[PDB]
Unconditional design. Structure first.
Ligand SMILES: [Ca+2]
Ligand SMILES: [Ca+2]
Ligand code: NA
Lengths: 161, 163
DNA sequence: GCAGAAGGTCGTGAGACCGTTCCG
DNA sequence: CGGAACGGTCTCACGACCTTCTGC
């Protein structure tokens, strides 16, 4: 149901007030790999503009979580997970300009995830993509993400790899 | 030569990192009315991303002015004036959402401008709209623009208007 | 005499995560 | 569980003008 100019407008707005990011969440309750990869895209806007986010929510099939207020007078719409992202990103990729690379990296992670879930070596290759995505969202002179270096170290220390 | 999805993308990017505004520029060298209504739409982005603005610039027929650095590590692309905006806005209005009204108000000012030039009373009506566009760019709790009130008082004390 | 190009900047509105709780 | 939804927030990257230099 997503028409071309709708996907295009959204990619434009996403390249503007939005974000495409990936991160590593520590999970104590997990087993061999005490980490969960989170992937997401989000739109941020001052709360009085909430309806506009709502509109994008409907155009995207009502996937995601909306917040009238994050707690600081700002509203957002966050779409987390491969389930939602595997459907949405393909529609926005052809129009994404500034954050096009980040989007393609999420997609790659989604591709690799199933087989990386419980394979230390694979999980690492997947974490390196998380670093790249995070680094793409930084200025050149900022300290680069180092999740791969830290996890490789941990995995060795734990005799997992 | 602007394609629909190109225009839609631009409208979305403009709604995000862009700005559509109007203002009054005092002009010491003007005749009857010493003010100029400056109209514009602009895109802003961090320095290192300047080439993305360049792309939009090319897509909008190279109209407007680019700045690799405003002076604070931020780059921008500003499209100023009726000539350029009367051509570009009509192309983006179909897809603008957040700043749609600001866009239609600039368009309205462009329609009225010709006859408001050397006409104090009409120039004020026009300035009322300049305040509206400016108010549309504020939070509801902020102090509204006062271009109309101050200009009227000036016109009155200058003998340019009688009521 | 008129106006677009180019300069400058304060007050945020965003971005890009990190944290904690819920749930089928 | 293995996400899914809810919370929270530092650090800027914007926005939306205002000011001044150019050009004819
Ligand atoms: Ca931005
Ligand atoms: Ca914005
Ligand atoms: Na923005």
């Amino acid at each position: 149901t997503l028409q071309p100019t709708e996907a295009a407008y959204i990619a434009g707005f996403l390249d503007g007030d939005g974000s495409i990011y990936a991160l590593l969440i520590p999970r104590p309750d997990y087993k061999d790999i005490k980490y969960q990869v989170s992937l997401a895209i989000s739109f941020i806007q001052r709360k009085d503009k909430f309806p506009y986010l709502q509109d994008i929510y409907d155009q995207l099939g009502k996937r995601g979580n909306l917040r009238k207020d994050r707690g600081d007078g700002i509203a957002d719409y966050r779409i987390i997970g491969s389930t939602h992202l595997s459907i949405i990103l393909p529609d926005l990729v052809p129009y994404l300009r500034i954050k096009k690379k980040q989007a393609n990296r999420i997609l790659h992670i989604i591709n690799l995830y199933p087989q990386a879930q419980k394979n230390p070596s694979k999980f690492l290759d997947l974490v390196k993509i998380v670093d790249d995505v995070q680094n793409l969202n930084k200025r050149a002179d900022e300290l680069k993400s180092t999740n791969y270096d830290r996890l490789l170290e941990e995995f060795l220390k734990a005799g997992k790899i």
